[PDB]
From a paper:
The gastric H+,K+-ATPase mediates electroneutral exchange of 1H+/1K+ per ATP hydrolysed across the membrane. Previous structural analysis of the K+-occluded E2-P transition state of H+,K+-ATPase showed a single bound K+ at cation-binding site II, in marked contrast to the two K+ ions occluded at sites I and II of the closely-related Na+,K+-ATPase which mediates electrogenic 3Na+/2K+ translocation across the membrane. One of the notable differences between HKA and NKA is the presence of Lys791 and its salt bridge partner Glu820 in HKA, which physically restrict K+-binding space at the site I position.
Therefore, we hypothesized that an additional mutation of Tyr340Asn in HKA could change the Asn792 rotamer conformation indirectly and make the Asn792 oxygen point to the K+-binding site. Moreover, as crystal quality often correlates with the thermal stability, triple mutant KS/ED/YN crystals in the BYK·Rb+·E2BeF form diffracted at an improved 3.2 Å resolution. As predicted, introduction of the Tyr340Asn mutation in HKA unlocked the sterically tight conformation of Tyr863 in TM7 and assumed the orientation of NKA. In the triple mutant, the oxygen atom of Tyr863 and the polar side chain of Asn792 are 3.3 Å apart, close to a favorable distance (3.2 Å) for a hydrogen bond to form between the nitrogen and oxygen atoms, and certainly close enough to interact directly without water. Although the rotamer conformation of Asn792 cannot be explicitly determined in the 3.2 Å resolution map, based on both the improved thermal stability and the hydrogen-bond network formed between Asn792 and surrounding side chains, it is likely that the rotamer is of NKA-type, i.e., the side chain oxygen faces towards the K+ at site II. However, the anomalous signal from bound Rb+ shows a globular density centered at site II and no significant density at the site I position, indicating that there is only one Rb+ bound, and that is at site II as in wild type HKA. However, a detailed comparison of the crystal structures of HKA triple mutant (KS/ED/YN) in the BYK99-bound E2BeF form, and NKA wild type in the bufalin-bound E2BeF suggested that an inappropriate position of Lys791Ser in HKA may be preventing an extra K+ from binding at the site I position. However, in the wild type and HKA triple mutant, Asp824 faces towards the other side by forming a hydrogen bond with Glu936 in TM8 (Val927 in NKA), and therefore does not interact with Lys791Ser at all (4.8 Å apart).
Numbering used by the authors:
A (entry chain B): 30 to 290
B (entry chain A): 47 to 1033
The structure:
């Protein structure tokens, strides 16, 4: 309505002054909040009792991962591979020069923070450990073959530990296609589909700047061609639980897979 | 046939028109056909009120059209969000139908509450079939009133309700009660002679609802049903369409404010939305999203419950209200236009003064016996009380020892029933005493002698002589007395007394009262021995030389609780105007008596009486009161009325028609007043309809007065109108208390969305939880405010100025959005930004993190530490950001309800616990919050999870900050009520 032109200034100055007094306490609250918070460890990590597990290559449709490709039509699978090549472009020996050969298999507790710029020590993981299915000797990860390779990868939680008993292994299996289909043949790389225990525990971007997650592949020989089938890849550890109905990726992956020819 | 021409026809002329006998009535066969042609002799009621259509209206109005418009926007947005395919659009469905639910459920609450209203009201009606004595084929017999047809021969007596519109043919002493149509409190004389051309002002017509008090007539039926003077008065009044209540207007100003912001708030953010870079469609969606965030879904319920509560507070006092908007109208009223007869007065002639023992005694004229009765200790009074008791033939109908004496119904004349309850109230058991003195002679009032007289054997047998007792017009008794009782002696009627009498008869004449003289004589036991055969035709006993007892005088007296009610209204700044169809003399009498015309104020017609200057030279500014009669008000205009109105503050309207009442109300309303008409009978229905709130009496009221009225007084206790101001003012305060509270919840509901689109942080607040706040957790607190005691002496305040003082004004809303709303949304963002950073997300990362955050195809997303979260995991974190932002709202809104307890006074001086409903609502508030979080499954049923107990307390520093900020603006507005602070920080 703009009744009193000059007194706006006073009420403008007032709101202006009012808001600035009010924005201050907010600033001075994150400022104190920022320094309540540890740069190393999550205060609560409340929503992560079990970790998530993703898969490559990731191709969704309506209602989740549906991977459908054609051995003969090199169009249907070239982009699934370039997904795997450029993903491992960060697992190359050259671009992982910042970490170290890890021999001690059972765990890794870096109590002392020893590496340049108050860093800590990250383990090496290069493409080689998925032997049949890196970029070389087969650039198409068994896709042109029709026995494709999928790599599985656990989400990291600072100071999360998956158990003492053994190595947590990926287990991928046919789901409800046994009537005439023999059970799924899968060769995992490294063998038995194991995750080596000396990548635990995770310490975070500040502690481990060049950290990289361990991988297991699954080369599926058995898969019937030109048949819609689903495949589930579950992880096995005592401190790991894979079935939450609100979160389907809590310890596993499902994917529709149709390999056409 | 027509109105003008029935009283002006000869018997030959009428009986030709209706093919009837003036002496032998209709035939039976024809009277039955006329009924087929004209239908019942009653009023066709207000026809057409379909039960499903009573319900529809409860869905329209200021808030409802807003809410519906909002629900529309929800669905257009939900659709546009399906073209550009969106998931979790269940929100827009959940949102729009929650809006369309509130509107609807309030319509039911309103409908059931008006249902309850009408049944309670039609529980107090009179449903007995009134009757007629008709003559047909030459048989006098009785029928129902309603079976009367035009042109019929009818008879009335004392006690008969006039069954139709009748044209008198012959009449014997027939006086009638017109107070329903006119204001006239004194019986009107009814004769067969055409008194006047206006059928209302003639005497040879009887009106379809009136009461024949005394006498007899025969006459012809000339109108029936809706075609009668009463039929016409209400068909007029229905024609009158009534304006919108002040409360209803206020609510709609409040909507022109809400939307006015929602549009201006929405449009700038949309224009900002385009520049951050957004498909026009999405920018125009967020425009939508936020105009709907400006609308409060729940407040249309809290308003309504608030009103119903004060509705019940009244009906507990027998004050029944037909709609809820009427619970406010009295508070905001400034002019009362009030009827005299039946509303201000009892419309019942009671004995009021008495000249005896050389003194004017004033009686008690109250129905509950609360006044000051007179001196009943004299031999003169005992004698006078004997004569007035013994010379009276009226009689209480049987079985009324329960009902109060004024309420008891008597067979007998006007003047005689007043004397009967008078004897019965003071002497006690009047008819019994009367029997102990057997009547041996009696003459009823005729013009042949112009008095009534009866001779009696006394009570003990040791007194074998007789008492003659006589009463009539005072002069006609004076010419027949030679003796006056005075002070235990029986003195001679010298000239001193023939002048004392005259000055008393006239002193009681100018008050507008009917005055009667009483007298007696003790006939000797020798001349008149037990058994003496008295004779009227040949006077064998004295009719002169009698002993004068005294004068008794009666008036139509105020209702007991009325003068105090007028005094309580006027002290509260309301103007009172009298509007009566009665003659100015008695009109001004009662207006003085009750408080319309203050003790010691004059008309120009009174100045000229003592100033002895012609009324023309008398000055107009000097006269405070003014009586304008109906004739005089005709030759005036809307300009000579307003100058009369704003000159004379104590205005009185005599001889005013049903329409002139409408006119007065209109001038006032057109001068910007909220008027209240307070009426009984049909002469008030029009006025009662045009009125901002029309108030009819529940017992003396007629059906048209009741039907036009918004509010009914079932005890007929005019003092309900005083408590109806204070209730109607309080809840108008308790509304801006309650709305100011519910408005500040919109800005901490909106900013998270405004931020969530403007800088793309993960969504901090979901509108399933906004629904929970607006409709589940904050309702009870907002209705608590309905129970706030006044913060001042409300009933000594002027009525609110409708132009300056609005329910919701710009400073009140701006105060809530921009200063209280601003501080709440800050207590969300912190508690949100910590819950993020505590769980892993640093604030500067939460910037622009939304696109990846909400992504279903990124199962692995890493936080500021670098842990990789999946979608449903950070969904749970976002749901937590909901539940954290939600209990940041409630912790302020405990500090918000306490602050909106009191607009000006410190909650320290008032108290934190005065309001007991408010405490129970805050314990209710903080219990739902707990149940929503820690009950199992709430994370999936709704968006509510078990919250870290550190996060409850994060906001509380902000709740106290609010308390202290309004406190210091409430402490600095009362201690320092200057100019700067009074306007900018106040509501
Ligand atoms: C104040 C507020 N509004 C919303 C909101 C959503 C989520 C949270 N919201 C909050 C906290 C979405 O479901 C929708 O975009 C929704 C919407 C509603 C009407 C018109 C257009 C969009 N608006
Ligand atoms: C891992 O092996 C040696 C240690 O035995 C290490 O120095 C070297 O960097 C790694 N091997 C190669 C081929 O680089
Ligand atoms: C992996 O490759 C080696 C040699 O290239 C071969 O012996 C082995 O059978 C391969 N695995 C599968 C599953 O074919
Ligand atoms: C796979 O691709 C080849 C080459 O385009 C095509 O001819 C063949 O029919 C495809 N198979 C199916 C099942 O569509
Ligand atoms: Mg009246
Ligand atoms: Rb809202
Ligand atoms: Rb008295
Ligand atoms: Rb009305």
């Amino acid at each position: 309505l703009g009744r009193t032109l000059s007194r706006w200034v006073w009420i403008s100055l007032y709101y202006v002054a009012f808001y600035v007094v009010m924005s201050g306490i907010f600033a001075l609250c994150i400022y104190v909040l920022m320094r309540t918070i540890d740069p190393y460890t999550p205060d609560y990590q409340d929503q992560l009792k079990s970790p998530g597990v993703t898969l490559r290559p990731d191709v969704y449709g309506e209602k989740g991962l549906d991977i459908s490709y054609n051995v003969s039509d090199s169009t249907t699978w070239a982009g699934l591979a370039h997904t795997l090549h450029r993903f491992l472009a960060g697992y190359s020996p050259a671009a992982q020069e910042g970490s170290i050969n890890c021999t001690s298999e059972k765990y890794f507790f870096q109590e002392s923070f020893l590496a340049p710029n108050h860093t800590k020590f990250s383990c090496k993981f290069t493409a080689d450990m998925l032997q049949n299915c890196s970029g070389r000797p087969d650039p198409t990860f068994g896709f042109a073959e029709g026995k494709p390779c999928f790599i599985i990868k656990m989400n990291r939680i600072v100071k999360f530990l998956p158990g003492n008993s053994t190595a947590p292994r990926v287990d991928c299996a046919f789901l409800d296609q046994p009537r005439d289909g023999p059970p799924l043949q899968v060769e995992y790389f490294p063998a038995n589909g194991t995750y080596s225990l000396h990548y635990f525990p995770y310490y975070g971007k500040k502690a481990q700047p060049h950290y990289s997650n361990p991988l297991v592949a699954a080369k599926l020989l058995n898969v019937p061609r030109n048949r819609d089938v689903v495949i589930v890849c579950k992880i096995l550890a005592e401190h790991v639980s894979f079935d939450n109905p609100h979160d389907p990726y809590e310890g596993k992956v499902e994917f529709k897979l149709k390999i056409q020819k | 046939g027509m109105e003008i021409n029935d009283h002006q026809l000869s018997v030959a002329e009428l009986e030709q028109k209706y093919q009837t006998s003036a002496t032998k009535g209709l035939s039976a066969s024809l009277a039955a056909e006329l009924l087929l042609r004209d239908g019942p002799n009653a009023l066709r009621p207000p026809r057409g009120t379909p039960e499903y259509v009573k319900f529809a209206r409860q869905l329209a109005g200021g808030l409802q059209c807003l809410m519906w418009v909002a629900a529309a926007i929800c669905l257009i947005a939900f659709a546009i969000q399906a073209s550009e395919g969106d998931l979790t659009t269940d929100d827009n469905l959940y949102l729009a139908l929650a809006l369309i639910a509130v509107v609807v459920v309030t319509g039911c609450f309103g409908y059931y509450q008006e249902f309850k209203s009408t049944n309670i009201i039609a529980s107090f009606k009179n449903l007995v079939p009134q009757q007629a004595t008709v003559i047909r084929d030459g048989d006098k017999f009785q029928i129902n009133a309603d079976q009367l047809v035009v042109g019929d021969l009818v008879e009335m007596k004392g006690g008969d309700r006039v069954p139709a519109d009748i044209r008198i043919l012959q009449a014997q002493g027939c006086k009638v009660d017109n107070s329903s149509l006119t204001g006239e409190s004194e019986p009107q004389t009814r004769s067969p002679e055409c008194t006047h051309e206006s059928p209302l002002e003639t005497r040879n017509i009887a009106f379809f609802s009136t009461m024949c008090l005394e006498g007899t007539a025969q006459g012809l039926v000339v109108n029936t049903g809706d075609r009668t003077i009463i039929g016409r008065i209400a068909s007029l009044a229905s024609g009158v369409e009534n304006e919108k209540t002040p409360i209803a207007i206020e609510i709609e100003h409040f909507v022109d404010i809400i939307a006015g912001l929602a549009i201006l708030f929405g449009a700038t953010f949309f224009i900002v939305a385009m520049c951050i870079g957004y498909t026009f469609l999405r920018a125009m969606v967020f425009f939508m999203a936020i105009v709907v965030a400006n609308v409060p879904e729940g407040l249309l319920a809290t308003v309504t419950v608030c009103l119903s509560l004060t509705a019940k507070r009244l009906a507990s006092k027998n004050c029944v209200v037909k709609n809820l908007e009427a619970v406010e109208t009295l508070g905001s009223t400034s002019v009362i236009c009030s009827d005299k007869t039946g509303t201000l007065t009892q419309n019942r002639m009671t004995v009021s003064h008495l000249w005896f023992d050389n003194h004017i005694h004033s009686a008690d004229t109250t129905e509950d016996q609360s006044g000051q009765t007179f001196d009943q200790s004299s031999e003169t009074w005992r004698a006078l009380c004997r004569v007035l008791t013994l010379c009276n033939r009226a009689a209480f109908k049987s079985g009324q020892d329960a009902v109060p004496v004024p309420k008891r119904i008597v067979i007998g004349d006007a003047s005689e029933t007043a004397l009967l309850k008078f004897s019965e109230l003071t002497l006690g058991n009047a008819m019994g005493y009367r029997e102990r003195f057997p009547k041996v002679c009696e003459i009823p009032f005729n013009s042949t002698n112009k008095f009534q007289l009866s001779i009696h054997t006394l009570e003990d047998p040791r007194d074998p002589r007789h008492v003659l007792v006589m009463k009539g017009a005072p002069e006609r008794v004076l010419e027949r007395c030679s003796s006056i009782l005075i002070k235990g002696q029986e003195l001679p009627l010298d000239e001193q007394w023939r002048e004392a009498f005259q000055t008393a008869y006239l002193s009681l004449g100018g008050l507008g009262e009917r005055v009667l003289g009483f007298c007696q004589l003790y006939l000797s036991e020798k001349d008149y021995p037990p058994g003496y055969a008295f004779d009227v035709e040949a006077m064998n006993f004295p009719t002169s030389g009698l002993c004068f007892a005294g004068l008794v005088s009666m008036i139509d007296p105020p209702r007991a609780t009325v003068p105090d009610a007028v005094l309580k209204c006027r002290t509260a700044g309301i103007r009172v105007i009298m509007v009566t169809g009665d003659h100015p003399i008695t009109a001004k009498a009662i207006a003085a008596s009750v408080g319309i015309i203050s003790e010691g104020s004059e008309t120009v017609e009174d100045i000229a009486a003592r100033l002895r200057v012609p009324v023309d030279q008398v000055n107009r500014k000097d006269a405070r009161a003014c009586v304008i009669n109906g004739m005089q008000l005709k030759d005036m205009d809307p300009s000579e009325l307003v100058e009369a109105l704003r000159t004379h503050p104590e205005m009185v309207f005599a001889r005013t028609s049903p329409q002139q009442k409408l006119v007065i109300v209109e001038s006032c309303q057109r001068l910007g007043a909220i008027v209240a008409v307070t009426g009984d009978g049909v002469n008030d229905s029009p006025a009662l309809k045009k009125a901002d709130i029309g108030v009819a009496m529940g017992i003396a009221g007629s059906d048209a007065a009741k039907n036009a009225a918004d509010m009914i007084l079932l005890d007929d206790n005019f003092a309900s109108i005083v408590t109806g101001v204070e209730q109607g003012r309080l809840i108008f305060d308790n509304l801006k208390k309650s709305i100011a509270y519910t408005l500040t919840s919109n800005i901490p509901e909106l900013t998270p969305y405004l931020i969530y689109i403007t800088v793309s942080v993960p969504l901090p607040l979901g509108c399933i939880t906004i629904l929970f706040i607006d409709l589940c957790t904050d309702i009870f607190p907002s209705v608590s405010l309905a129970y706030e005691k006044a913060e001042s002496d409300i009933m000594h305040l002027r009525p609110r100025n409708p132009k300056r003082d609005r329910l919701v004004n710009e400073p009140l809303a701006a105060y809530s959005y921009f200063q209280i709303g601003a501080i709440q949304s800050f207590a969300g963002f912190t508690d949100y930004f910590t819950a993020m950073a505590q769980e892993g997300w640093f604030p500067l990362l939460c910037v622009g993190l939304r696109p990846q955050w909400e992504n279903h195809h990124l199962q692995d997303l890493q936080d500021s530490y670098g842990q990789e979260w999946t979608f449903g995991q950070r969904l749970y974190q976002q749901y937590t950001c909901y539940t954290v932002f939600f209990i940041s709202i409630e912790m302020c809104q405990i500090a918000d309800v306490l602050i909106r307890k009191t607009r000006r006074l410190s909650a320290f001086q008032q108290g934190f616990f005065r309001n007991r409903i408010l405490v129970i609502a805050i314990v209710f508030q903080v219990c739902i919050g707990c149940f929503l979080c820690y009950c199992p499954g709430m994370p999936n049923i709704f968006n509510f999870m078990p919250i870290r107990f550190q996060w409850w307390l994060v906001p509380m520093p902000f709740s106290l900050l609010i308390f202290v900020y309004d406190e210091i603006r409430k402490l600095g507005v009362r201690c320092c009520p200057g100019s700067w602070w009074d306007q900018e920080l106040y509501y």
